[PDB]
Amino acid sequence: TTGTATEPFHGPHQAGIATPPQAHAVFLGLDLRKGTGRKELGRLMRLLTDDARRLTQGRPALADPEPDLAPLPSRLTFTFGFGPGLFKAAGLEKQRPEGLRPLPPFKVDRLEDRWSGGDLLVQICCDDPITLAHALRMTVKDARAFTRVRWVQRGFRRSPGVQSSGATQRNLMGQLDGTVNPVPGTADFDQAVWVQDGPEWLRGGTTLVLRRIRMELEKWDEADPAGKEFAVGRRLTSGAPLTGRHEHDEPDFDAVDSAGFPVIAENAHIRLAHVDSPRLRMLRRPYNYDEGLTADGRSDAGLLFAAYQADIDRQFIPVQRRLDEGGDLLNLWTTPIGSAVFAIPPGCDENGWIGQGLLG
Amino acid sequence: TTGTATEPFHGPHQAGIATPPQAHAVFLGLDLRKGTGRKELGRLMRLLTDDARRLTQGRPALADPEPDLAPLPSRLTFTFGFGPGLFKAAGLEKQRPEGLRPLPPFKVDRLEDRWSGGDLLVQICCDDPITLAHALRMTVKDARAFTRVRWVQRGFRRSPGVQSSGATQRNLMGQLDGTVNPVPGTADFDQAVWVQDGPEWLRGGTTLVLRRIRMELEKWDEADPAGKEFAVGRRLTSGAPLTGRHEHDEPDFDAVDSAGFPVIAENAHIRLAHVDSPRLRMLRRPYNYDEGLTADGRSDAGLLFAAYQADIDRQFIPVQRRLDEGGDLLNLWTTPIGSAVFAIPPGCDENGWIGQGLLG
Ligand code: HEM
Ligand code: HEM
């Protein structure tokens, strides 16, 4: 069933990346306390490893504060990530990937400290929110002594069983989101996602760019539907490129309209975001968020934009830079308010723990 | 797939009450603007009725800001409720039920204005959070001109398919929650829930007591495990009464231990909460909430306690008063921080609108 289903914890890679995105996610951003060094980090990651090892398979954690909430794992997964500040605290500043650093400033940025940065990431995904809540509590319980909570970001996708697996789901702007994306279990995916160069310990792992992007829905509603599709380069209902018919049709960036102007605008989102080389693409694995209203009924909603790639400098920044300097029409209705980066180590087997190659 | 499943909007009763509780809920508490009188309330409820009429069946609302999010309704339901202030503004004090008033003070209360009161309730329930978020957006769009958002309370239960329908689900304290409840499709349920006395307009309707109850999970983890079961009167895992073996075993309130003391404490939750007459019982239809963390790792979680009954004075207050005056052991780890009451009108058909019998 949806409840008894599990995702393996062990493997060459950490789960929660190639894993088809579950219905719910929480991104826990932690800062290290002063007394938390390499020794303490080792004890912590061993604690959290075994917690994930048990919980993801429906078994209570060690010293579980509520073991009856451990069953029904619902494809629970844990993904741990190390921020730039982690390495200095560990005395391993040399093994920090040179590419692992806070993203540079962009003109559209309205970043807030409460949604940015972080020394240690715990990404917990699950098809069930009760199972997720319990997993979060256990995580905090074992991380409490060594860290402070910098932020916690919750997001959702479709509930399990609403749409078939692999089918593209819509975001809170009504747009089909995830059409062009590296496919798990393919060569292009492995090259695009998993690290092969750089520091040894990170090989088999990846890097995460997590950006909290607010959807300016008040402005969005006042926009012209033709203008909305034009801004993206795809139709709302079908999800097809404006040059095409079906969702999976290849956009024609050389096509022009009756006026000789590009059908897909020069500053259309998918044009500026596109990279011709599949091996340089980023894995987008986003979650939607919707959190409360002002008295005048203005929404606080958007996207937890989670991008995974082997090299931030080669695979993310160039794209984000083109969106910014290219004057992406979508920037009129979206605003980055948070940004964090993490190095996600390789997976482990029954005889190890996440981050052993670094902290061991 | 389950996205296409719907619940009837039309009927003698509003949906979202007898309806088997969906995986997600938003309780939207609205305060009327100064100029919003009976005329304005009529226009508002006609707008909201039609929105629900279309959206619950997977059709876009009129002036829908994002029509592509209307399909796949996932058992979306709307339940509208009128607070005490609604009747004042509409000049229909004569039609206000005697019992429709803010609840009396209780010792355990730590109520906050930001979680209490409200003139107009829109209770939106759905098995899918994207569908839910869209429904909320449309509700606010048409309500903005007439009302201010007093509060929005988001809650969740198990995702669809995680547990078989009707099976008791656990709360964030790990406790099986919902064992003793009136059952739809029985005469006792109708007697307990649907109004058949008082002013004419409300017949076929019901009343809602909505209380935001914080869970003191800090103390809860520190609590003695045997004391936790003793506090409730049931075992954690099995859910059985301490006098029994299975969940649905009848609690024996006359039973004593070998020392001659009651097996179920005189101040046990279920003892103080129990009522002999099934027809006097309240319908409990709660949702769980989990909302963020302090720097030092303290959770902010609890229960959205939604109780439905034909008569607040006869079915809710007597129970709540016994829990308070009786010194319910569960009060050591639970704290009411919000309280609101609403009169829920009967259902409508085509050509009709919710609250028409009152406001029309
Ligand atoms: C912030 C809110 C955003 C929304 C609502 C959004 C929406 C979309 C949509 C509707 C598509 C077309 C369907 C698809 O291929 O997935 C798309 C494509 C894409 N987006 Fe975004 N996007 C957002 C931000 C970003 C950002 C910040 C990046 C940074 C890299 C990005 C990278 C991409 C890429 C690489 C594609 C693939 C385009 C292609 O090759 O055809 N998106 N996005
Ligand atoms: C966080 C707050 C609360 C929690 C965690 C909680 C938990 C529970 C549990 C575990 C049970 C036994 C299983 C069941 O029969 O559902 C129960 C029963 C019950 N509760 Fe509560 N409860 C809470 C607040 C309240 C409040 C404020 C009321 C006010 C009336 C209430 C009324 C009842 C009733 C009527 C029963 C049925 C007991 C019986 O007749 O055997 N509960 N509750």
Side-chain angles (χ1 to χ4, degrees), chain A residues 24 65-66 68 72 127-131 133 137 140 144 148-149 154 156-159 161-162 170 173-174 220-221 236-237 290 292-298, chain B residues 1-2 24 33 65-66 68 127-131 133 137 140 144 148-149 154 156-159 162 170 173-174 218 220-221 237 290 292 294-298:
Chain A
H24 296 276
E66 215 64 73
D68 293 284
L72 307 178
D127 274 332
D128 185 85
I130 291 177
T131 305
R137 286 211 66 226
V140 173
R144 230 168 142 160
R148 285 186 178 87
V149 183
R154 287 190 185 75
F156 58 84
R157 298 174 60 83
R158 291 290 188 180
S159 280
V162 175
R170 295 179 185 273
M173 279 168 71
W220 182 245
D221 295 346
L236 261 176
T237 303
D290 185 29
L293 299 157
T294 64
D296 273 25
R298 301 303 176 183
Chain B
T1 52
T2 63
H24 295 274
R33 293 179 187 273
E66 218 63 74
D68 292 290
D127 274 334
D128 185 83
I130 294 180
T131 307
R137 283 215 63 218
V140 173
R144 178 180 304 109
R148 286 189 178 83
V149 181
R154 309 165 165 286
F156 60 83
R157 297 173 60 80
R158 292 288 188 180
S159 284
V162 172
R170 298 177 184 274
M173 276 165 54
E218 292 299 294
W220 187 244
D221 291 348
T237 305
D290 185 33
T294 69
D296 58 326
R298 286 142 48 216

Coordinates of all heavy atoms in Angstrom, one line a residue, chain A residues 24 65-66 68 72 127-131 133 137 140 144 148-149 154 156-159 161-162 170 173-174 220-221 236-237 290 292-298, chain B residues 1-2 24 33 65-66 68 127-131 133 137 140 144 148-149 154 156-159 162 170 173-174 218 220-221 237 290 292 294-298:
Chain A
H24 N 5.2 15.0 0.1 CA 5.5 16.0 1.1 C 7.0 16.0 1.3 O 7.7 15.0 1.2 CB 4.8 15.7 2.4 CG 3.3 15.9 2.2 ND1 2.6 17.1 2.3 CD2 2.3 14.9 2.0 CE1 1.3 16.9 2.2 NE2 1.1 15.6 2.0
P65 N 10.8 9.0 20.5 CA 9.9 9.5 21.4 C 8.4 9.1 21.2 O 7.5 9.3 22.0 CB 10.1 11.0 21.3 CG 10.5 11.2 19.8 CD 11.3 10.0 19.5
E66 N 8.2 8.6 20.0 CA 6.8 8.1 19.6 C 6.9 7.0 18.6 O 6.6 7.2 17.4 CB 6.0 9.3 19.1 CG 4.5 9.3 19.5 CD 4.3 9.4 21.0 OE1 4.5 10.5 21.5 OE2 4.0 8.4 21.6
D68 N 5.1 4.5 17.9 CA 3.9 4.1 17.2 C 3.6 4.9 15.9 O 2.7 4.5 15.1 CB 2.7 4.2 18.1 CG 2.7 3.2 19.3 OD1 2.4 2.0 19.1 OD2 3.0 3.7 20.4
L72 N 4.1 2.5 8.8 CA 3.6 3.2 7.7 C 4.6 4.3 7.2 O 4.3 5.5 7.1 CB 2.2 3.9 8.0 CG 1.2 3.0 8.6 CD1 -0.1 3.8 8.9 CD2 0.8 1.9 7.7
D127 N 5.4 10.4 1.5 CA 4.1 10.5 0.9 C 3.0 10.8 1.9 O 1.9 11.1 1.6 CB 3.7 9.2 0.2 CG 4.2 9.1 -1.2 OD1 4.4 10.2 -1.9 OD2 4.5 8.0 -1.7
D128 N 3.4 10.7 3.2 CA 2.4 11.0 4.3 C 3.0 12.0 5.3 O 4.1 12.0 5.7 CB 2.2 9.7 5.1 CG 1.1 9.8 6.1 OD1 -0.1 9.7 5.8 OD2 1.5 10.1 7.3
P129 N 2.1 13.0 5.6 CA 2.6 14.1 6.5 C 2.7 13.8 8.0 O 3.4 14.5 8.7 CB 1.5 15.2 6.3 CG 0.3 14.4 5.9 CD 0.7 13.3 5.1
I130 N 2.0 12.8 8.4 CA 2.1 12.3 9.8 C 3.5 11.6 10.0 O 4.2 11.9 11.0 CB 0.9 11.4 10.3 CG1 -0.3 12.2 10.3 CG2 1.2 10.8 11.6 CD1 -1.6 11.5 10.7
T131 N 3.8 10.7 9.1 CA 5.1 10.1 9.1 C 6.2 11.1 9.0 O 7.2 10.9 9.7 CB 5.2 9.0 7.9 OG1 4.1 8.1 8.0 CG2 6.5 8.3 8.0
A133 N 6.1 14.3 9.9 CA 6.2 15.1 11.2 C 7.0 14.3 12.2 O 7.8 14.9 12.9 CB 4.8 15.4 11.7
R137 N 10.6 15.3 14.0 CA 10.8 15.3 15.5 C 12.0 14.5 15.9 O 12.8 15.0 16.8 CB 9.5 14.8 16.2 CG 8.4 15.7 16.2 CD 7.5 15.6 17.4 NE 8.2 16.0 18.6 CZ 8.3 15.4 19.8 NH1 7.7 14.2 19.9 NH2 9.0 15.9 20.8
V140 N 15.2 16.4 14.9 CA 15.5 17.5 15.8 C 16.0 17.0 17.2 O 16.9 17.5 17.8 CB 14.2 18.4 16.1 CG1 14.5 19.4 17.1 CG2 13.8 19.0 14.8
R144 N 19.4 18.4 18.2 CA 19.2 19.5 19.2 C 20.5 19.9 19.9 O 20.8 21.1 20.1 CB 18.2 19.1 20.2 CG 17.1 20.1 20.4 CD 15.9 19.5 21.2 NE 15.3 20.4 22.1 CZ 14.1 20.3 22.6 NH1 13.3 19.3 22.3 NH2 13.7 21.2 23.5
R148 N 21.5 24.5 16.1 CA 20.3 25.3 16.2 C 19.6 25.3 14.9 O 20.2 25.2 13.8 CB 20.7 26.8 16.6 CG 21.2 27.0 18.0 CD 21.4 28.5 18.3 NE 21.8 28.7 19.7 CZ 23.0 28.7 20.1 NH1 24.0 28.4 19.3 NH2 23.3 28.9 21.4
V149 N 18.2 25.4 15.0 CA 17.4 25.4 13.8 C 17.5 26.8 13.2 O 17.0 27.8 13.8 CB 15.9 25.0 14.1 CG1 15.1 25.0 12.8 CG2 15.9 23.7 14.8
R154 N 8.6 23.7 4.6 CA 7.8 22.6 4.2 C 7.1 22.9 2.9 O 6.8 24.0 2.6 CB 6.7 22.4 5.3 CG 7.1 21.8 6.6 CD 5.9 21.4 7.4 NE 6.3 20.9 8.8 CZ 6.7 21.7 9.7 NH1 6.8 23.0 9.6 NH2 7.1 21.1 10.9
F156 N 4.7 20.8 -0.6 CA 3.9 19.7 -1.0 C 3.8 19.6 -2.5 O 4.0 20.5 -3.3 CB 2.5 19.8 -0.4 CG 1.8 21.1 -0.8 CD1 1.1 21.2 -2.0 CD2 1.8 22.1 0.1 CE1 0.5 22.4 -2.3 CE2 1.1 23.3 -0.2 CZ 0.5 23.4 -1.4
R157 N 3.5 18.4 -3.0 CA 3.1 18.1 -4.4 C 1.8 17.5 -4.3 O 1.1 17.5 -3.3 CB 4.2 17.3 -5.1 CG 5.6 17.9 -5.1 CD 6.6 17.0 -5.7 NE 6.3 16.5 -7.0 CZ 6.6 17.2 -8.1 NH1 7.2 18.4 -8.1 NH2 6.2 16.8 -9.3
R158 N 1.4 16.8 -5.4 CA 0.1 16.1 -5.4 C 0.1 15.0 -4.4 O 1.2 14.4 -4.1 CB -0.2 15.5 -6.8 CG -0.5 16.5 -7.9 CD -1.9 17.2 -7.6 NE -2.3 18.1 -8.7 CZ -3.4 18.8 -8.8 NH1 -4.2 18.8 -7.8 NH2 -3.6 19.5 -9.9
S159 N -1.0 14.7 -3.7 CA -1.1 13.6 -2.8 C -0.9 12.3 -3.6 O -1.1 12.3 -4.8 CB -2.5 13.5 -2.2 OG -2.5 14.4 -1.1
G161 N -1.3 9.0 -5.5 CA -2.5 8.3 -6.2 C -3.4 9.3 -6.9 O -4.4 8.9 -7.5
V162 N -3.1 10.6 -6.9 CA -3.9 11.6 -7.6 C -3.6 11.5 -9.1 O -4.5 11.6 -9.9 CB -3.7 13.0 -7.0 CG1 -4.5 14.0 -7.8 CG2 -4.1 13.1 -5.6
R170 N 1.3 20.1 -11.7 CA 1.2 21.6 -11.8 C 1.7 22.3 -10.5 O 1.5 21.7 -9.4 CB -0.2 22.0 -12.1 CG -0.7 21.5 -13.5 CD -2.1 22.0 -13.8 NE -2.6 21.4 -15.1 CZ -2.4 22.0 -16.3 NH1 -1.8 23.1 -16.4 NH2 -2.9 21.4 -17.3
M173 N 0.9 28.2 -9.8 CA 0.6 29.2 -10.8 C -0.2 28.5 -11.9 O -0.4 29.0 -13.0 CB 1.9 29.8 -11.4 CG 2.4 31.0 -10.5 SD 4.0 31.6 -10.9 CE 3.7 32.3 -12.5
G174 N -0.5 27.2 -11.7 CA -1.3 26.4 -12.6 C -0.5 25.8 -13.7 O -1.0 25.1 -14.6
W220 N 0.1 38.2 -10.8 CA -0.2 37.1 -11.7 C -1.6 37.1 -12.2 O -1.9 36.9 -13.4 CB 0.2 35.8 -11.0 CG 0.0 34.6 -11.9 CD1 -0.9 33.5 -11.7 CD2 0.8 34.2 -13.0 NE1 -0.7 32.6 -12.7 CE2 0.3 33.0 -13.5 CE3 1.8 34.8 -13.8 CZ2 0.8 32.3 -14.6 CZ3 2.3 34.2 -14.9 CH2 1.8 32.9 -15.3
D221 N -2.6 37.3 -11.3 CA -4.0 37.3 -11.6 C -4.3 38.5 -12.6 O -5.3 38.4 -13.4 CB -4.8 37.4 -10.4 CG -4.7 36.2 -9.5 OD1 -4.1 35.2 -10.0 OD2 -5.1 36.2 -8.3
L236 N -0.7 26.9 -21.1 CA -1.0 26.6 -19.7 C -1.7 25.2 -19.6 O -1.2 24.3 -18.9 CB -2.0 27.6 -19.1 CG -1.4 28.6 -18.2 CD1 -2.5 29.6 -17.8 CD2 -0.8 28.0 -16.9
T237 N -2.7 25.0 -20.4 CA -3.5 23.7 -20.3 C -2.7 22.5 -20.8 O -2.5 21.5 -20.1 CB -4.8 23.8 -21.1 OG1 -5.6 24.9 -20.6 CG2 -5.6 22.5 -20.9
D290 N 2.4 27.0 0.6 CA 1.3 27.9 0.8 C 1.0 28.2 2.3 O 0.5 27.3 3.0 CB 0.0 27.3 0.1 CG -1.2 28.3 0.1 OD1 -0.9 29.5 0.1 OD2 -2.3 27.9 0.2
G292 N -0.5 30.9 4.8 CA -1.2 32.0 5.5 C -1.5 33.2 4.7 O -0.9 33.4 3.6
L293 N -2.3 34.0 5.2 CA -2.9 35.2 4.5 C -2.8 36.5 5.3 O -2.9 36.4 6.5 CB -4.4 34.9 4.2 CG -4.6 33.7 3.2 CD1 -6.1 33.2 3.4 CD2 -4.4 34.1 1.8
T294 N -2.7 37.6 4.6 CA -2.8 38.9 5.3 C -4.3 39.1 5.5 O -5.2 38.4 5.0 CB -2.2 40.0 4.4 OG1 -3.0 40.1 3.2 CG2 -0.8 39.7 4.1
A295 N -4.6 40.2 6.3 CA -6.0 40.5 6.6 C -6.8 40.8 5.3 O -7.9 40.5 5.2 CB -6.0 41.7 7.5
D296 N -6.1 41.4 4.3 CA -6.7 41.8 3.1 C -6.7 40.6 2.1 O -7.0 40.7 0.9 CB -6.0 43.0 2.4 CG -6.6 44.3 2.9 OD1 -7.2 44.3 4.0 OD2 -6.5 45.3 2.2
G297 N -6.3 39.4 2.6 CA -6.4 38.2 1.8 C -5.3 38.1 0.7 O -5.6 37.7 -0.4
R298 N -4.1 38.4 1.1 CA -3.0 38.3 0.1 C -2.2 37.1 0.5 O -1.8 36.9 1.6 CB -2.1 39.5 0.1 CG -2.9 40.8 -0.3 CD -3.6 40.7 -1.7 NE -4.4 41.8 -2.0 CZ -5.1 41.9 -3.1 NH1 -5.2 40.9 -4.0 NH2 -5.9 43.0 -3.4
Chain B
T1 N -6.3 5.8 -10.1 CA -6.1 7.1 -9.5 C -7.3 7.6 -8.8 O -8.4 7.3 -9.2 CB -5.6 8.1 -10.5 OG1 -6.5 8.1 -11.7 CG2 -4.2 7.7 -11.0
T2 N -7.1 8.6 -7.9 CA -8.2 9.0 -7.0 C -8.5 10.5 -7.2 O -9.4 11.0 -6.5 CB -7.9 8.8 -5.5 OG1 -6.7 9.5 -5.2 CG2 -7.6 7.3 -5.3
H24 N -6.6 16.6 4.1 CA -6.2 18.0 4.3 C -7.3 18.9 4.6 O -8.4 18.7 4.0 CB -5.3 18.6 3.2 CG -4.0 17.8 3.0 ND1 -2.9 18.2 3.7 CD2 -3.6 16.8 2.2 CE1 -1.9 17.4 3.4 NE2 -2.3 16.6 2.5
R33 N -16.3 43.3 7.1 CA -15.9 44.7 7.1 C -17.0 45.5 7.5 O -18.2 45.1 7.6 CB -15.4 45.0 5.6 CG -14.1 44.4 5.2 CD -13.8 44.7 3.8 NE -12.6 44.0 3.3 CZ -11.3 44.3 3.5 NH1 -11.0 45.4 4.1 NH2 -10.4 43.5 3.0
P65 N -8.9 32.3 -11.1 CA -7.6 32.9 -11.5 C -6.7 31.8 -12.1 O -5.7 32.1 -12.7 CB -7.1 33.4 -10.1 CG -7.8 32.6 -9.1 CD -9.1 32.3 -9.6
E66 N -7.0 30.5 -11.8 CA -6.2 29.4 -12.3 C -7.0 28.2 -12.6 O -7.0 27.2 -11.8 CB -5.1 29.1 -11.2 CG -3.8 28.8 -11.8 CD -3.2 29.9 -12.6 OE1 -2.7 30.9 -12.0 OE2 -3.2 29.8 -13.9
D68 N -6.9 25.8 -14.5 CA -6.2 24.5 -14.7 C -6.0 23.7 -13.4 O -5.7 22.5 -13.5 CB -4.9 24.7 -15.5 CG -5.1 25.2 -16.9 OD1 -5.6 24.4 -17.7 OD2 -4.7 26.3 -17.2
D127 N -8.5 15.8 -0.3 CA -7.5 14.8 -0.2 C -6.2 15.3 -0.8 O -5.1 14.6 -0.7 CB -8.0 13.5 -0.9 CG -8.8 12.6 0.1 OD1 -8.6 12.7 1.3 OD2 -9.6 11.8 -0.4
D128 N -6.2 16.4 -1.5 CA -5.0 16.9 -2.2 C -4.8 18.4 -1.8 O -5.7 19.2 -1.8 CB -5.2 16.8 -3.7 CG -4.0 17.2 -4.5 OD1 -3.0 16.4 -4.6 OD2 -3.9 18.4 -4.9
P129 N -3.5 18.7 -1.5 CA -3.1 20.0 -1.0 C -3.1 21.1 -2.1 O -3.2 22.3 -1.9 CB -1.8 19.8 -0.4 CG -1.2 18.7 -1.1 CD -2.3 17.8 -1.4
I130 N -2.8 20.7 -3.4 CA -2.8 21.6 -4.5 C -4.2 22.1 -4.8 O -4.5 23.3 -4.9 CB -2.1 21.0 -5.8 CG1 -0.6 20.8 -5.5 CG2 -2.3 22.0 -7.0 CD1 0.1 20.2 -6.6
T131 N -5.1 21.1 -4.9 CA -6.5 21.4 -5.1 C -7.0 22.3 -4.0 O -7.8 23.3 -4.2 CB -7.4 20.1 -5.1 OG1 -6.8 19.2 -6.1 CG2 -8.8 20.4 -5.5
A133 N -5.2 24.4 -2.0 CA -4.6 25.7 -2.0 C -5.4 26.6 -3.1 O -5.6 27.7 -2.9 CB -3.2 25.6 -2.4
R137 N -7.5 30.0 -2.6 CA -7.3 31.2 -3.4 C -8.6 31.8 -3.9 O -8.8 33.0 -3.8 CB -6.3 30.9 -4.5 CG -4.9 30.8 -4.1 CD -4.0 31.3 -5.2 NE -4.2 32.7 -5.4 CZ -4.2 33.4 -6.5 NH1 -3.9 32.7 -7.7 NH2 -4.4 34.7 -6.6
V140 N -10.8 33.4 -1.1 CA -10.3 34.7 -0.7 C -10.5 35.8 -1.8 O -10.8 36.9 -1.5 CB -8.7 34.7 -0.4 CG1 -8.2 36.0 -0.1 CG2 -8.5 33.7 0.8
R144 N -12.6 38.9 -0.3 CA -11.8 40.0 0.0 C -12.5 41.4 0.2 O -12.2 42.2 1.1 CB -10.6 40.2 -1.0 CG -9.7 41.4 -0.8 CD -8.7 41.5 -1.8 NE -7.8 40.3 -1.9 CZ -7.9 39.4 -2.9 NH1 -8.7 39.6 -4.0 NH2 -7.1 38.4 -2.9
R148 N -12.3 40.6 6.2 CA -10.9 40.6 6.5 C -10.6 39.2 7.1 O -11.4 38.6 7.8 CB -10.4 41.6 7.6 CG -10.4 43.0 7.0 CD -9.7 44.0 8.1 NE -9.6 45.3 7.6 CZ -10.6 46.2 7.6 NH1 -11.8 45.9 8.0 NH2 -10.4 47.4 7.1
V149 N -9.4 38.6 6.7 CA -9.0 37.3 7.2 C -8.5 37.5 8.7 O -7.5 38.1 9.0 CB -7.8 36.8 6.4 CG1 -7.4 35.4 6.9 CG2 -8.1 36.7 4.9
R154 N -4.5 25.6 9.2 CA -4.2 24.4 8.3 C -4.0 23.2 9.1 O -3.2 23.2 10.0 CB -3.0 24.8 7.4 CG -3.1 26.1 6.7 CD -1.8 26.6 6.1 NE -2.0 27.6 5.1 CZ -2.5 27.5 3.9 NH1 -2.9 26.3 3.5 NH2 -2.6 28.5 3.1
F156 N -3.8 18.5 8.8 CA -3.6 17.3 8.0 C -3.9 16.0 8.8 O -3.8 16.0 10.0 CB -2.2 17.3 7.4 CG -1.1 17.2 8.4 CD1 -0.8 16.0 9.0 CD2 -0.4 18.3 8.8 CE1 0.3 15.9 9.9 CE2 0.6 18.3 9.7 CZ 0.9 17.1 10.3
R157 N -4.3 15.0 8.0 CA -4.4 13.7 8.5 C -3.6 12.8 7.6 O -2.7 13.3 6.9 CB -5.9 13.2 8.5 CG -6.8 14.1 9.4 CD -8.3 13.8 9.3 NE -8.5 12.4 9.7 CZ -8.7 11.9 10.9 NH1 -8.5 12.7 11.9 NH2 -8.9 10.6 11.1
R158 N -3.8 11.5 7.6 CA -3.0 10.6 6.8 C -3.3 10.9 5.3 O -4.5 11.2 5.0 CB -3.4 9.1 7.1 CG -2.9 8.6 8.4 CD -1.4 8.5 8.5 NE -1.0 7.8 9.8 CZ 0.3 7.6 10.1 NH1 1.3 7.9 9.3 NH2 0.5 7.0 11.3
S159 N -2.3 10.7 4.5 CA -2.6 10.8 3.0 C -3.5 9.7 2.6 O -3.6 8.7 3.2 CB -1.2 10.7 2.2 OG -0.5 11.9 2.4
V162 N -3.0 5.5 2.7 CA -2.0 5.1 3.7 C -2.7 4.2 4.7 O -2.0 3.2 5.1 CB -1.4 6.3 4.4 CG1 -0.6 5.9 5.6 CG2 -0.6 7.2 3.5
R170 N -3.7 8.0 14.0 CA -3.1 8.5 15.2 C -2.8 10.0 15.1 O -2.6 10.6 14.0 CB -1.8 7.8 15.5 CG -1.9 6.3 15.7 CD -0.6 5.6 15.9 NE -0.7 4.2 16.0 CZ -0.9 3.6 17.2 NH1 -1.0 4.2 18.3 NH2 -1.0 2.2 17.2
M173 N 0.7 12.9 19.0 CA 1.2 12.4 20.3 C 1.2 10.9 20.2 O 1.4 10.2 21.2 CB 0.3 12.9 21.4 CG 0.7 14.2 22.0 SD -0.6 15.0 23.0 CE -0.9 13.7 24.2
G174 N 1.0 10.3 19.0 CA 1.1 8.9 18.8 C -0.2 8.1 19.2 O -0.2 6.9 19.0
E218 N 7.3 18.7 24.5 CA 8.4 18.8 25.4 C 8.1 18.0 26.6 O 8.9 17.1 27.0 CB 8.8 20.2 25.7 CG 9.3 21.0 24.6 CD 10.6 20.4 24.0 OE1 11.6 20.4 24.7 OE2 10.6 19.9 22.9
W220 N 5.6 16.0 27.1 CA 5.1 14.7 26.6 C 6.2 13.7 26.5 O 6.1 12.5 27.0 CB 4.4 14.9 25.3 CG 3.7 13.6 24.8 CD1 4.0 12.9 23.7 CD2 2.6 13.0 25.5 NE1 3.1 11.8 23.6 CE2 2.2 11.9 24.7 CE3 1.8 13.2 26.6 CZ2 1.2 11.0 25.0 CZ3 0.8 12.4 27.0 CH2 0.5 11.3 26.2
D221 N 7.4 14.1 26.0 CA 8.5 13.2 25.8 C 9.1 12.8 27.2 O 9.6 11.7 27.4 CB 9.6 13.8 25.0 CG 9.2 13.9 23.5 OD1 8.2 13.3 23.1 OD2 9.9 14.6 22.7
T237 N -0.3 1.6 21.8 CA -0.2 0.8 20.6 C -1.6 0.2 20.2 O -2.0 0.4 19.1 CB 0.8 -0.4 20.8 OG1 2.1 0.2 21.2 CG2 1.0 -1.2 19.5
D290 N 1.4 21.0 12.4 CA 2.8 21.0 12.8 C 3.5 22.2 12.1 O 3.6 22.2 10.8 CB 3.4 19.7 12.4 CG 4.9 19.6 12.8 OD1 5.2 20.1 13.9 OD2 5.7 18.9 12.1
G292 N 6.7 24.5 12.4 CA 7.9 25.2 12.6 C 8.6 25.0 13.9 O 8.0 24.5 14.9
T294 N 11.6 26.4 17.0 CA 12.5 27.5 17.6 C 13.9 27.1 17.4 O 14.2 26.0 17.0 CB 12.2 27.6 19.1 OG1 12.7 26.4 19.8 CG2 10.7 27.8 19.4
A295 N 14.8 28.1 17.6 CA 16.2 27.8 17.4 C 16.7 26.6 18.2 O 17.5 25.9 17.7 CB 17.0 29.1 17.8
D296 N 16.3 26.5 19.4 CA 16.7 25.4 20.3 C 15.9 24.1 20.1 O 16.0 23.2 20.9 CB 16.7 25.8 21.8 CG 15.3 26.2 22.2 OD1 14.6 26.8 21.4 OD2 15.0 26.0 23.4
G297 N 15.1 24.0 19.0 CA 14.5 22.8 18.6 C 13.2 22.4 19.3 O 12.9 21.3 19.4
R298 N 12.4 23.4 19.7 CA 11.1 23.2 20.3 C 10.0 23.2 19.2 O 10.0 24.2 18.4 CB 10.8 24.2 21.4 CG 11.5 24.0 22.7 CD 11.9 25.3 23.3 NE 10.8 26.2 23.3 CZ 11.0 27.6 23.2 NH1 12.1 28.1 22.9 NH2 9.9 28.3 23.2

